[PDB]
Amino acid sequence: AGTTYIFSKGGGQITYKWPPNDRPSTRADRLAIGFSTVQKEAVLVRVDSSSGLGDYLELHIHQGKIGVKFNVGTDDIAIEESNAIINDGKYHVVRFTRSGGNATLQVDSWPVIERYPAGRQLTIFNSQATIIIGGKEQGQPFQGQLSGLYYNGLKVLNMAAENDANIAIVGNVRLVG
Amino acid sequence: AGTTYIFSKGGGQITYKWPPNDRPSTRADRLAIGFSTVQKEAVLVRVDSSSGLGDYLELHIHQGKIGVKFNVGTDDIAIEESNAIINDGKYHVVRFTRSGGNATLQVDSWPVIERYPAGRQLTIFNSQATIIIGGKEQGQPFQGQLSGLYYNGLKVLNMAAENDANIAIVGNVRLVG
Amino acid sequence: RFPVVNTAYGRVRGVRRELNNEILGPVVQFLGVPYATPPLGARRFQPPEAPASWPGVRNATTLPPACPQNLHGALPAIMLPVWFTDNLEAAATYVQNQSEDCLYLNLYVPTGKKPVMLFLHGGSYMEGTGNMFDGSVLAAYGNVIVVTLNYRLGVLGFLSTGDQAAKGNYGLLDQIQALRWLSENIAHFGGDPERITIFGSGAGASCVNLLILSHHSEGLFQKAIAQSGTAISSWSVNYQPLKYTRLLAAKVGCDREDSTEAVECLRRKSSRELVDQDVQPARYHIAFGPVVDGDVVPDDPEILMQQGEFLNYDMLIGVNQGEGLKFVEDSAESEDGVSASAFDFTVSNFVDNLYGYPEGKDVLRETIKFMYTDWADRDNGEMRRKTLLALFTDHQWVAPAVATAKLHADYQSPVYFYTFYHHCQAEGRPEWADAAHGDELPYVFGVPMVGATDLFPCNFSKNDVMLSAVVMTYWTNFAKTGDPNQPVPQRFEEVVWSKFNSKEKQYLHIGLKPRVRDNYRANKVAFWLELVPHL
Amino acid sequence: RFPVVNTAYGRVRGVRRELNNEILGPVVQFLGVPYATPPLGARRFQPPEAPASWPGVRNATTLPPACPQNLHGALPAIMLPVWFTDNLEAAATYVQNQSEDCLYLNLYVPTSGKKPVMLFLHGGSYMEGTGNMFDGSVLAAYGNVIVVTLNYRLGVLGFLSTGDQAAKGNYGLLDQIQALRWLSENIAHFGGDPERITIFGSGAGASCVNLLILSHHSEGLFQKAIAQSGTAISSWSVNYQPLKYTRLLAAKVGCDREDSTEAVECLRRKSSRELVDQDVQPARYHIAFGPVVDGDVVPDDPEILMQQGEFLNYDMLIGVNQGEGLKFVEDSAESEDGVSASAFDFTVSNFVDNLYGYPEGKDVLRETIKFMYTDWADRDNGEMRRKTLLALFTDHQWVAPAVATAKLHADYQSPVYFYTFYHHCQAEGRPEWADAAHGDELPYVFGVPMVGATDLFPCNFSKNDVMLSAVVMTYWTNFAKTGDPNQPVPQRFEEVVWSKFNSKEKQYLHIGLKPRVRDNYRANKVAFWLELVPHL
Numbered sequence A, B: 001a002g003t004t005y006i007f008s009k010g011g012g013q014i015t016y017k018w019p020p021n022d023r024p025s026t027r028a029d030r031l032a033i034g035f036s037t038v039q040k041e042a043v044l045v046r047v048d049s050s051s052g053l054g055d056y057l058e059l060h061i062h063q064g065k066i067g068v069k070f071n072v073g074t075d076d077i078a079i080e081e082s083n084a085i086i087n088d089g090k091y092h093v094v095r096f097t098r099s100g101g102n103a104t105l106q107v108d109s110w111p112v113i114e115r116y117p118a119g120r121q122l123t124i125f126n127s128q129a130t131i132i133i134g135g136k137e138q139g140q141p142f143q144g145q146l147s148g149l150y151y152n153g154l155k156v157l158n159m160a161a162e163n164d165a166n167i168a169i170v171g172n173v174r175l176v177g
Numbered sequence C: 001r002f003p004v005v006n007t008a009y010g011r012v013r014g015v016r017r018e019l020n021n022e023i024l025g026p027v028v029q030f031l032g033v034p035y036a037t038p039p040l041g042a043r044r045f046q047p048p049e050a051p052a053s054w055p056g057v058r059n060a061t062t063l064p065p066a067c068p069q070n071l072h073g074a075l076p077a078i079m080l081p082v083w084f085t086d087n088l089e090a091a092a093t094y095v096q097n098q099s100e101d102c103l104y105l106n107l108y109v110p111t112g113k114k115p116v117m118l119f120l121h122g123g124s125y126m127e128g129t130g131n132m133f134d135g136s137v138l139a140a141y142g143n144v145i146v147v148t149l150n151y152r153l154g155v156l157g158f159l160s161t162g163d164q165a166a167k168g169n170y171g172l173l174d175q176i177q178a179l180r181w182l183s184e185n186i187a188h189f190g191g192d193p194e195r196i197t198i199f200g201s202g203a204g205a206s207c208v209n210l211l212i213l214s215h216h217s218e219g220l221f222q223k224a225i226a227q228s229g230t231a232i233s234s235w236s237v238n239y240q241p242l243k244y245t246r247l248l249a250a251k252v253g254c255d256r257e258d259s260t261e262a263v264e265c266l267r268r269k270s271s272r273e274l275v276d277q278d279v280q281p282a283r284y285h286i287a288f289g290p291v292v293d294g295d296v297v298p299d300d301p302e303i304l305m306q307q308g309e310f311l312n313y314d315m316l317i318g319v320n321q322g323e324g325l326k327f328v329e330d331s332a333e334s335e336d337g338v339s340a341s342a343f344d345f346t347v348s349n350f351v352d353n354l355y356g357y358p359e360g361k362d363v364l365r366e367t368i369k370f371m372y373t374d375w376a377d378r379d380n381g382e383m384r385r386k387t388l389l390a391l392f393t394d395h396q397w398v399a400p401a402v403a404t405a406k407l408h409a410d411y412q413s414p415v416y417f418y419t420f421y422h423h424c425q426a427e428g429r430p431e432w433a434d435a436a437h438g439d440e441l442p443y444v445f446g447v448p449m450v451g452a453t454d455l456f457p458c459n460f461s462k463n464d465v466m467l468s469a470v471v472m473t474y475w476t477n478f479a480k481t482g483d484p485n486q487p488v489p490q491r492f493e494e495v496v497w498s499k500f501n502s503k504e505k506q507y508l509h510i511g512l513k514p515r516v517r518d519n520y521r522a523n524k525v526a527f528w529l530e531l532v533p534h535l
Numbered sequence D: 001r002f003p004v005v006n007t008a009y010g011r012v013r014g015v016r017r018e019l020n021n022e023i024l025g026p027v028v029q030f031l032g033v034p035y036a037t038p039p040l041g042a043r044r045f046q047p048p049e050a051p052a053s054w055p056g057v058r059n060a061t062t063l064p065p066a067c068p069q070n071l072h073g074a075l076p077a078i079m080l081p082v083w084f085t086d087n088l089e090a091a092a093t094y095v096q097n098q099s100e101d102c103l104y105l106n107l108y109v110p111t112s113g114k115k116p117v118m119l120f121l122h123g124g125s126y127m128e129g130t131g132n133m134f135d136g137s138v139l140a141a142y143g144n145v146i147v148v149t150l151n152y153r154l155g156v157l158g159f160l161s162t163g164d165q166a167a168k169g170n171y172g173l174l175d176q177i178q179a180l181r182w183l184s185e186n187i188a189h190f191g192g193d194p195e196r197i198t199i200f201g202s203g204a205g206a207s208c209v210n211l212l213i214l215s216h217h218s219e220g221l222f223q224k225a226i227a228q229s230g231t232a233i234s235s236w237s238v239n240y241q242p243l244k245y246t247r248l249l250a251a252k253v254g255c256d257r258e259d260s261t262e263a264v265e266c267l268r269r270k271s272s273r274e275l276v277d278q279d280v281q282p283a284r285y286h287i288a289f290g291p292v293v294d295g296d297v298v299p300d301d302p303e304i305l306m307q308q309g310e311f312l313n314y315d316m317l318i319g320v321n322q323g324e325g326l327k328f329v330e331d332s333a334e335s336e337d338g339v340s341a342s343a344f345d346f347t348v349s350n351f352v353d354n355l356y357g358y359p360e361g362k363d364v365l366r367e368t369i370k371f372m373y374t375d376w377a378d379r380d381n382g383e384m385r386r387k388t389l390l391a392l393f394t395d396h397q398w399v400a401p402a403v404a405t406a407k408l409h410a411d412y413q414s415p416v417y418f419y420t421f422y423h424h425c426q427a428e429g430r431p432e433w434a435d436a437a438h439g440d441e442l443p444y445v446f447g448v449p450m451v452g453a454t455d456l457f458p459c460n461f462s463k464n465d466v467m468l469s470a471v472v473m474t475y476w477t478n479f480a481k482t483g484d485p486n487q488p489v490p491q492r493f494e495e496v497v498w499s500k501f502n503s504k505e506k507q508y509l510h511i512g513l514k515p516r517v518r519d520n521y522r523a524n525k526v527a528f529w530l531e532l533v534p535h536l
């Protein structure tokens, strides 16, 4: 576990907003984060596009199963760790690689589940805008502990602990020390 | 009887040009003139519209028969005195009244010849600009005595003697008396 | 003084009313001198006849009664002038003594011999009167004799069936009778029976363009000033008289299968019973109006003037900047302009009502949606209300006026084109608007030089008075010599109003900054005259 | 001095050629350094690979041979730049040593941080051109940017395809991508920055730039793109029916086997000059051998691809000239009057027949595009019909596609800068009525005026031309340095701020002797071509 952040009652949200002229658009996505919580319904990280574009990426725990759902333009594609239980209070890490429609999701050292959609799928996540951690405004606030958020060469928590000018924190998001 | 203009060898022409802003358009027309000649083929008078418009009116003797032919927009209507020979050297007169498409031609004391063209015919004589006496431009010169040209209250021959500016005489036309 | 002038039928008396302004001479007004026998009984629905001589003398001092009409009814509110519909309560005062015997005229003689200017009123063919316009300021200023008449309107003046039972066009015949009375009776009043001008605005202007193409009016007049009107627009003539006359006959109480029987039954009914009947025509059309029969209007006015069936009259045609101000009437209550959902609905209804061709109703709609939209302000809103107003003005008033000006100038007749732009600042009229339909009548009649009347309560500045003087001088010069700038010289002193040649369609941009321009809305006019026929 | 720089495959010797002008420093030229294996034998009609390391030092001084082509043939003159068509004899001098092995690039290096890289993608069409024609030794010295001009397979040997797997096609685009990869992994030794690699080009080469944006092969190779007078959505940008022309060439060359693999194998045996001299003529306003939609380089057609945001947010600079279809009116350009009505009607009808050709309705489209493109204030001018015809061709082929691609790129939050060149150097043989034509912006970008007239540009150059050239390369080098044509180097050009191209507010900048930032370039005609003609 890297820079651990603790979420308490009520929760909160931490937002990393890219500069307007340096917003990235990438074919492939790489997410990785460790966590420890007992919540049955929560959202860990939400990645949004700019105004108008409907491209999105979301990671959430529903009914005790962690999963990632993304909209790349054609339709929503979701991959979930169905044959497991994750809200048992123990620390578990999750990794996710994306290539167009193809999505590989792994948790702990268990075998990687793969999703290979059929038909023509768009492959471009257009004009990333903000990284949201907490999911409180979405509708399912997250309470627990998070660590080591890695996103395509951007360690969100590591630079957030450095108090960079492009990160804003609100709520019960506290730093473990 | 009145002011008579004679035609010498070669030929001649008398042209009346209407003022640029005083060219009249008439639904009904009158044309009376006394003539005396022995030429088998000739043209006496010819009234033309302005540039572009195809409306015209002419009086001509063919094969010893005098007749009036006009174009008012639909078709050429020509009414000719057939049961008379007029180029015997005597002094005759001819009158022609036009109303709508209907025409009436009368020579001396002979019975009137009336023409009612079939179908609905154009009527208005649009923007008369010139009157031509002698018709040297057409190709048939005139050699004889002409007097009393009456055209809708206009006496071209009378004004020609009084040295009217608009009236122009070109060729071998001489005034008698 | 109460001078008396002898006419060919008798002797009439008038008054010598004085004007408010101090630069105009006294004007002798003869109000209510008849010009035809009253068409009351069996003479109803018949062409007018010459009046009856009277013994002794007759004052003409009270305004004559107006023709029967239903002003508080379903009049066509699109073709009517804006000041008529705005001040409908004040304009109803003038038509208060309505009677069937309404054939009269009023002369305003000022104090070679002075010309005559006849005014043909009428925003539509079913309303208005000649008593509204006091042509006394124009008479004194221009030293011309202004005549304003009352002619039969509506059912009593334009009902027709197509056959010889009721040919129609009784209003045009009444106007021609008034012209004849002026021709054979104006020499006694000091007028010149050889310099008669005829002019009017609105549907009356259409009457002017239907008197030029009429065989009846050959030598009665020699000039014409048709402003904001045409005989080729959609609401100028009536091509389905039998349908609407049968609808009216069925509604009133007798619809005989024989046309003559129906006409004879109608002649037995009171004027107010069948005038008050509400027969609604199709949109952008009329129910009762001029009809093509063969006597007054021989053929279609669009076909008649293409073949040059007119007698070479000097013409002064004109339009306004935006005349379809009443086309956009439901969109004047919105802070913004019209929404994108309100711009494709008005255009669709416009195409359905006016063209309505199933084969090409989806191609024409798209191309006239694309043409009348500002692509530099595609999502402005206000510049969609402006473009809708421009679309209606271009189709109804500007394109027919340009077409008729071209047709008249092609056959070598003097045509002068004008485009009124200035407008008096009214009370309730929107600020974004411009010179609406019939907004030049106050300036032509010298309303600003006397003040705001009931019909025009608008505030007038010095610029309005100057423009009124300018336009009145232009009109009077045209009446005097057929040239707007020849007799009386007047940035308005150095502008030479040139002719309207077909090759270069020069005109005068009448307004606060006049200038002789080159082509008035060439793109849209060419769109309506050349491309739309090809589609 | 002949400096030596070690690349990743060996060491190359350059030169230190100096410039005529005074304010420009010396330039080092590594002319002719290879970047891929020669596609000579069985490697013909195959994608390029990495080069072969040479033990020792390679002398890189002479201009490398140009790729096989045929200038004195049946070239499509409508799409070629005006200066290339006019001076064809002078331009043929550069293409004199043509050989099949032509995969070489030339670097020009000057002498605030690490210098950027500007690759130039030449080619008025896909059958002609060479990187030796443009000397980038002036732009490199002025803007302190390493300028790289390459040579890639052209015409028959570069873009032949059948749709099957026998010959996928777009070998020229693969050569360009290989050159970009070589620059990315080898420019650090010459002093360049492998993270600021702009690519720019004019004419059909600019199309390649657009076709290099929608391709996933060139993901991280370059960062920016300057596409001037070119698009990937015009009529002559992509070849949609390669099989017909390939089979026609195969029949005309000798072997037309029914199976595509056998035909390709036979074609690989013909020498490079026999299959190039063949006269395979495409339909008018189209191309015979060009980029082909297959799935590897171009996944789908470029028009569909850019609608659904299939690009990776490249800073982009589009531009057009005033009138580029100068060769649309060439049969009626040496007459006292302009175009008669009987000839305007015929030209518009031929245009509609060749381009649209819709059996459902053409008696409506012809009349509406005739009415739209005519001045009704001077309807009978005659001379003002050549201008309208030139505007028609320019609007349909060059202006509307450029505006459409700028709007589609700006709709996904990518910096888009639109320019409209309006000045033209006074040519000896060009008509006086003619305005800035196709390819007349290339002399200014490369700084020809500050050096003088050449064989390719025999023009007079005054002081105004020199000032405009300096300004144009200042803008281009600022864009290369920072992606914003106003930031790094201060500049009626002093008080003009070049703004982005928003879809709602299409602000552009008007290059010329009277610069100004305007709001909508030909909004009426562009909207006509984009939003009305599709409805008809």
Ligand SMILES: *[C@@H]1O[C@H](CO)[C@@H](O)[C@H](O)[C@H]1NC(C)=O
Pocket (backbone or CB within 6 Å): A099, A100, A101, A102, A116, A123
């Ligand atoms: C997804 O996987 C399929 C099958 O392995 C492959 O054909 C496709 O190219 C992959 N998509 C991407 C974007 O790599």
Ligand SMILES: *[C@@H]1O[C@H](CO)[C@@H](O)[C@H](O)[C@H]1NC(C)=O
Pocket (backbone or CB within 6 Å): B099, B100, B101, B102, B116, B123
């Ligand atoms: C011409 O004659 C016919 C038959 O007599 C008549 O009906 C018609 O009215 C006449 N034309 C004119 C213009 O009077």
Ligand SMILES: *[C@@H]1O[C@H](CO)[C@@H](O)[C@H](O)[C@H]1NC(C)=O
Pocket (backbone or CB within 6 Å): C057, C058, C059, C060, C061
């Ligand atoms: C006309 O009116 C005046 C004033 O009302 C009146 O005195 C006069 O008698 C009237 N005229 C006649 C002929 O009665």
Ligand SMILES: *[C@@H]1O[C@H](CO)[C@@H](O)[C@H](O)[C@H]1NC(C)=O
Pocket (backbone or CB within 6 Å): C459
């Ligand atoms: C209209 O004119 C009157 C009289 O000059 C003036 O008092 C009034 O203020 C003017 N209009 C307005 C709204 O001020």
Ligand SMILES: *[C@@H]1O[C@H](CO)[C@@H](O)[C@H](O)[C@H]1NC(C)=O
Pocket (backbone or CB within 6 Å): D056, D057, D058, D059
């Ligand atoms: C390069 O040129 C030098 C001098 O001409 C010569 O000595 C050397 O061998 C050359 N090298 C190659 C690879 O041609």
Ligand SMILES: *[C@@H]1O[C@H](CO)[C@@H](O)[C@H](O)[C@H]1NC(C)=O
Pocket (backbone or CB within 6 Å): D453, D459, D460, D461
């Ligand atoms: C440069 O312009 C002058 C006119 O000022 C012209 O005569 C001259 O020929 C031009 N330069 C060249 C090299 O021709």
Ligand SMILES: [Ca+2]
Pocket (backbone or CB within 6 Å): A055, A072, A073, A122, A123, A124, A125, A126, D308, D309
């Ligand atoms: Ca997308």
Ligand SMILES: [Ca+2]
Pocket (backbone or CB within 6 Å): B055, B072, B073, B122, B123, B124, B125, B126, C307, C308
């Ligand atoms: Ca005629």
